[PDB]
From a paper:
Here we investigate the role of histone demethylases in plant flowering through the analysis of Arabidopsis JMJ13, which we show possesses H3K27me3 site-specific demethylase activity in vitro and in vivo. The recombinant expressed JMJ13 catalytic domain (JMJ13CD, residues 90–578) displayed unambiguous demethylation activity against H3K27me3 peptides, but not H3K4me3, H3K9me3, or H3K36me3 peptides, confirming that JMJ13 is an H3K27me3 site-specific histone demethylase. JMJ13 has a central catalytic domain flanked by flexible regions on both N- and C-termini. Our genetic studies suggest that JMJ13 acts as a flowering repressor, which modulates flowering time in a temperature- and photoperiod-dependent manner.
The crystal structure of the JMJ13 catalytic domain (JMJ13CD), including the predicted jumonji, helical, and zinc finger domains, in complex with the co-factor α-ketoglutarate (α-KG), was determined to 2.4 Å resolution. Despite being in different subfamilies, the overall structure of JMJ13CD resembles the previously reported structures of human KDM5A/B/C and Arabidopsis JMJ14, which are composed of two parts: the jumonji domain and the helical plus zinc finger domains. The jumonji domain adopts a typical α-KG-dependent oxygenase fold with a double-stranded β-helix in the center surrounded by several α-helices. A Ni2+ ion, which replaced the endogenous Fe2+ ion during nickel column purification, and the co-factor α-KG are located in the active center of the jumonji domain. The helical domain consists of four long α-helices forming a helical bundle. However, our structural analysis showed that the predicted C5HC2 zinc finger of JMJ13 in fact adopts a C4HCHC arrangement, which is composed of a CCCH-type zinc finger (Cys500, Cys503, Cys522, and His525) and a CCHC-type zinc finger (Cys514, Cys516, His519, and Cys534). Rather than the predicted Cys507, the His525 contributes to zinc coordination in the C4HCHC-type zinc finger domain in JMJ13. Although the C4HCHC zinc finger domain is embedded in the primary sequence of the helical domain, structurally it forms an independent domain that interacts with the helical domain in a similar manner to the helical and C5HC2 domains of JMJ1424.
Residue numbers in the entry: 93 to 564
The structure:
């Protein structure tokens, strides 16, 4: 009946001055104790661009064009073949012609293309989902390119809140990656129209996401605190099963997949089960941040262009760990080299003791403790596993490991410190598997690849072990 739409509590909205703006990771660390309780927050930029998004796309790039995907409005009404077809049924557009198409579609629905009040279009979207006749909507996700100006005078484009600079920021955990990952080491452009949506979900590897709106109509977000994630999933599993949420029967599988088979469902279903939901209505010039493991969904109120990138800081490491477990449980290759990030950050902290002790913030210090704790646990397990491996006598070979991260052939967990290699190089395994029970077609000789500086890292671990707050 849609009363809920305007009784939904709104997420925190921050309005820093220029001098407080700093870089987004430092700023997030200052506001984290409050904002992280909500899962989502909004930050009004105190910096305006000099060259607006359309002028960047038309003047600072050559013949910018993009291809859309076709998104069904009611996901559960379609089988798995129709979804494939939908993805590739898009069309190539200029920025301008996509704008005009969206405006003419909007005007055909509402007799005028003028932006309508936020409450009106929110109710319109949910009533369309529930009983509308529009089948699909066109949008351009995951487009590569940026609308931040590269011009030197641009206050926004030359700031650290230019999302192309985020992943290399000093507090960005993923600054340590040597490989590129779209959406993760680089932002991506999103171009939407009326009712184009992002269904309920959590980022890969439980990363943060930060999203800037460059221009166009409002964008409504619903966010779930990270602390409610499990509850969210529990409730969704019940409501899909009672057919409170429309989908195809789950037939087990994994929540990540079942979610992909549900028609987007309104926050009232979750409110009725006492999981908190907070609303953000984002307009050009505002950033929206979602926190690790914070479920979020939303939709566009008309033509709009935004830009997003995912990231991590120290405080993310406990969440990454949980994600790695799920990745391993589902037998899926993780997105990030978790072990390698732990070890690199930890050795950086072990290397310097005076930059960190003197001026640290609480969230930064907690992230440092999370890194040190993850590192200590990793080194301990590896030490015990190596001791057992040695005593068994089933791994005669030993090689100094100078590779990057490798993927385990059985559980697909990332291996940075150590792996057990086979006689043919195609069946390496992490150190969690019983060597005696490996039946490999290449033979039975097993070689431990062990990172060259393992002793330095054990010493760093033993020293972190004794520090206050590193409690294991
Ligand atoms: O821009 C969008 O529509 C997707 C936003 C999102 O899912 C994110 O930034 O995490
Ligand atoms: Ni997202
Ligand atoms: Zn494994
Ligand atoms: Zn082999």
């Amino acid at each position: 009946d849609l009363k809920w739409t305007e009784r939904l509590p709104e997420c925190p909205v921050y309005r820093p001055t220029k001098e407080e703006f700093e870089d987004p990771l430092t700023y997030l660390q200052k506001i984290f104790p409050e904002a992280s309780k909500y899962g989502i927050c909004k930050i009004v930029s105190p910096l305006t661009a000099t060259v607006p998004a359309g002028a960047v796309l038309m003047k600072e790039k050559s013949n910018f064009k993009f291809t859309t995907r076709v998104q069904p409005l009611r996901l559960a009404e379609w089988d798995s073949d129709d979804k494939v077809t939908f993805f590739m049924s898009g069309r190539t557009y200029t920025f301008r012609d996509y704008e005009k198409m969206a405006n003419k579609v909007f005007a055909r629905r509402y007799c005028s293309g003028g932006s309508l009040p936020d409450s009106f279009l929110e109710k319109e979207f949910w009533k369309e989902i529930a009983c509308g006749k529009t089948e699909t909507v066109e949008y351009a996700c995951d487009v590569d390119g940026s609308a931040f100006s590269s011009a030197p005078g641009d206050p926004l484009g030359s700031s650290k809140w230019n999302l192309n600079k985020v992943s290399r920021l000093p507090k960005s955990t993923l600054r340590l990656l040597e490989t590129s990952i779209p959406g993760v080491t680089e932002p991506m452009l999103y171009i939407g129209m009326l009712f184009s949506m992002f269904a309920w979900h959590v980022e890969d590897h439980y990363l943060y996401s930060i999203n800037y709106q460059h221009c166009g109509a409002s964008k409504t977000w619903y966010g779930i605190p990270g602390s409610a994630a499990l509850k969210f999933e529990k409730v969704v599993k019940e409501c899909v099963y009672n057919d409170d949420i429309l989908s195809t029967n789950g037939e087990d599988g994994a929540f990540d997949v079942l979610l992909g088979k549900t028609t987007i469902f309104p926050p009232k279903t979750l409110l009725d089960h006492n999981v908190p939901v907070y609303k953000a209505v984002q307009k050009p010039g505002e950033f929206v941040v979602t926190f690790p493991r914070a479920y979020h969904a939303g939709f566009s109120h008309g033509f709009n262009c935004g830009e997003a990138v995912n990231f991590a800081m120290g405080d993310w490491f406990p969440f990454g760990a949980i994600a790695s477990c799920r990745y391993a449980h589902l037998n899926r290759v993780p997105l990030l080299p978790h072990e390698e990030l732990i070890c690199k950050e930890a050795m950086l902290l072990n290397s310097s003791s005076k930059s960190e002790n003197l001026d640290l913030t609480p969230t930064e210090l907690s992230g440092q403790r999370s890194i040190k704790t993850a590192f200590v646990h990793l080194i301990r397990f590896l030490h015990l596993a190596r001791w057992s491996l040695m005593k068994s006598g089933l791994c005669t070979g030993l090689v100094s490991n100078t590779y990057g991260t490798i993927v385990c052939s059985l559980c697909k967990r990332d291996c940075y410190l150590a792996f057990i290699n086979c006689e043919c190089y195609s069946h390496p395994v992490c150190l969690r598997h019983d060597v005696k029970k490996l039946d490999l077609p290449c033979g039975t000789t097993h070689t431990l690849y062990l990172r060259d500086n393992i002793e330095d890292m054990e010493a760093a671990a033993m020293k972190f072990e004794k520090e206050d707050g590193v409690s294991d």
